[PDB]
């Protein structure tokens, strides 16, 4: 029975000169820290136990106390930034990195987990873990011919810790560290375990959330086709990070965007744009908006895949945030599209849901919609059809909205609505 000791008992045992009494009290500490009702992390920290646990990490001749203190320190490090800091301040980083070499899989796994909590605190501790040299021993834990021979929970913990080394910005992780880690991430992106795949996708989405040189580091490894495949997965915990990574990638150059189109991503968007999860619809529409901001032949691929009716559908009925992203998709489309493409977009029914959205209480979406309207009117002048479109906007209640928006707080709103009223409704 090491169940339900007091912190004072734990301190008394850890302070004895008896390694076995210390092992008993460390296991008591661990069981205290792995109950879910409010683990007394701060009392353990305050008792001054962290340096003792960290020294127990180096008792290679008593592997049980290595394990129990590794687990206790893991759970302290799982807490607030101050609690993680207390663990780091006890010298835990190099001791856990040494434990990565342990012959006992449960102990090296626990060192992997602890290092993942430390790195997961943020940029500074992530970079400190990297500077102490964790990446090579971590990656060496995966240097086997076939990932499937590793224990499931083990491989999952390693994948999660690696993704935490890829995570966070300001600054993003060191370029050389990202380059060291990426080949292993690519291998994990082809593993068959859903949880490994989800965490690998999260890591790729972190690496692609930056400037185009970061995106390019990833796209150059040729993972986009695999990301599109995962974009078609049935498991939502996979589709969410695959979609986020794909959308990050299309915020880059038109050639990076083109790699996404080339890999076949557009064929998944009918189901993504009607997906029952609001966040999937929102992120798919955001991705579409950064694709309609591309070249006219890319706008044309959007058209050929039949996606303009889906954008019309999401503009007509969706969560308001999704509708804002659809408004952006439409304004980008109209800004870059040919006149034929803008005409197509009107023929699909864009005007009425665009009008209906002008009555929303969000300034930016109203600016976005008015900009799209102006672009469509300019395509109409190019065809001498401005009267027809004026009639359409008047026929669905739009004119009332633009006129009422003449008297609006925002400067751009009233300026643009007044411009439209004078240029086309007079």
């Amino acid at each position: 029975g090491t169940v339900n000791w007091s912190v004072e008992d734990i301190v008394k045992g850890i302070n004895s000169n008896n390694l076995e009494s210390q092992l008993q009290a460390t296991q008591a500490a661990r069981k205290l820290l792995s109950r879910e009702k409010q683990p007394p992390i701060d009392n353990i920290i305050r008792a001054g136990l962290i340096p003792k646990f960290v020294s127990f990490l180096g008792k290679t001749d008593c592997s049980p106390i290595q394990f129990e203190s590794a687990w206790a320190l893991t759970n302290i490090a799982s807490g607030t930034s101050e609690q993680t800091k207390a663990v780091v301040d006890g010298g835990a980083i190099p001791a856990f990195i040494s434990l990565l070499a342990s012959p006992h899989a449960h102990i090296s796994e626990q060192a992997v987990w602890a290092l993942g909590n430390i790195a997961g605190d943020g940029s500074a501790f992530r970079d400190l873990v990297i500077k102490h040299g964790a990446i090579d021993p971590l990656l060496a834990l995966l240097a086997v011919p076939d990932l499937s021979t590793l224990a499931c929970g083990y491989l999952r913990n390693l994948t999660w810790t690696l993704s935490n080394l890829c995570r966070n910005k300001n600054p993003a992780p060191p370029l050389d560290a990202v380059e060291q880690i990426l080949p292993t991430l690519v291998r994990l992106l082809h593993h068959n375990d859903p949880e490994v795949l989800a965490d690998s996708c999260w890591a790729i989405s972190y690496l692609t959330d930056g400037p185009n040189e970061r995106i390019e580091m990833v796209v150059k490894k040729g993972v986009v086709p695999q990301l599109v495949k995962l974009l078609g997965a049935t498991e939502l915990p996979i589709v969410t990070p695959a979609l986020r990574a794909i959308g990050n990638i299309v915020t880059g150059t038109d050639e990076q965007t083109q790699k996404v189109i080339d890999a076949g991503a557009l064929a998944v968007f009918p189901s993504l744009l009607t997906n029952p999860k609001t966040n999937i619809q929102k992120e798919a529409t955001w991705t579409m908006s950064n694709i309609t901001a591309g070249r006219q032949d890319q706008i044309q691929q959007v058209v050929n895949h039949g996606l303009v009716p889906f954008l019309v559908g999401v503009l007509s009925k969706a969560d308001f945030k999704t509708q804002k992203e659809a408004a952006w998709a439409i304004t980008n489309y109209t800004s870059g599209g040919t006149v034929e493409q803008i005409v197509y977009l009107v023929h699909c029914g864009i005007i009425e849901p665009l009008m209906n959205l002008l009555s929303a209480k969000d300034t930016k979406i109203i600016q976005v919609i008015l900009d799209a309207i102006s672009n469509i009117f300019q395509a109409a002048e190019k065809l001498g059809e401005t009267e027809k479109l004026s009639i359409m906007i008047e026929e669905c209640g739009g004119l009332d909205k633009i006129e009422a928006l003449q008297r609006h707080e925002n400067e751009s709103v009233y300026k643009a609505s007044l411009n439209l009223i004078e240029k086309y409704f007079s």
């Binding site: 820290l33 792995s34 683990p39 687990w71 893991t74 759970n75 490090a77 799982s78 807490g79 993680t84 626990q110 987990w113 993942g116 909590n117 997961g120 605190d121 999660w160 935490n164 995570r167």
Partner: peptide, 7 residues
Amino acid sequence: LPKRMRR
């Protein structure tokens, strides 16, 4: 998800 307690 960024930090994980065991058990």
